[PDB]
Design a protein around this ligand. Structure first.
Ligand code: HEC
Length: 107
């Protein structure tokens, strides 16, 4: 599974790599990417008000630690045709820290 991460290290990764396109809090706005509030336990393509690709909506998995850990390593391999332009976070410790941050920040 996915080892526990450091939320402060994960917050720094989020601001430097994700915040350009995403907010996390309840009521945060959509940007190039969807607001991520309520991410854990919900299916792909479900944030109210955001226009997703068919690729994202078709994936149909439930976001959680394990699916995020795979996705964030290589987004386009996990969801071919997604419009999220993000190379990938290769290091497992960095993915784990970011995931820990998301688990709290999107609660
Ligand atoms: C803008 C250049 C982006 C960056 C940088 C990151 N993301 Fe993104 N993300 C973006 C878009 C346009 C979309 C929608 C893709 C589609 O095909 O419609 C997404 C989607 C995600 C998702 C899925 C959300 C869902 O509701 O299904 C996740 C979990 C996500 N993005 C996470 C994420 C993180 C943690 C990032 C930093 C490592 C990140 N994204 C960067 C656009 C952009």
């Amino acid at each position: 599974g996915v080892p526990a991460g450091d939320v402060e290290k994960g917050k720094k990764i989020f601001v430097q790599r994700c915040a350009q396109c995403h907010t996390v809090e309840a009521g945060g706005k959509h940007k190039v990417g969807p607001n991520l509030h309520g991410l854990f336990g919900r299916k792909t393509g479900q944030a109210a008000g955001f226009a997703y690709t068919d690729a994202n909506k078709a994936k149909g998995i439930t976001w959680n630690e394990d699916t995020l850990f795979e996705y964030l390593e290589n987004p386009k391999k996990y969801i071919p045709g997604t419009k999220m332009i993000f190379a990938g976070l290769k290091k497992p410790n960095e993915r784990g820290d970011l995931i820990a941050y998301l688990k709290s920040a999107t609660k």
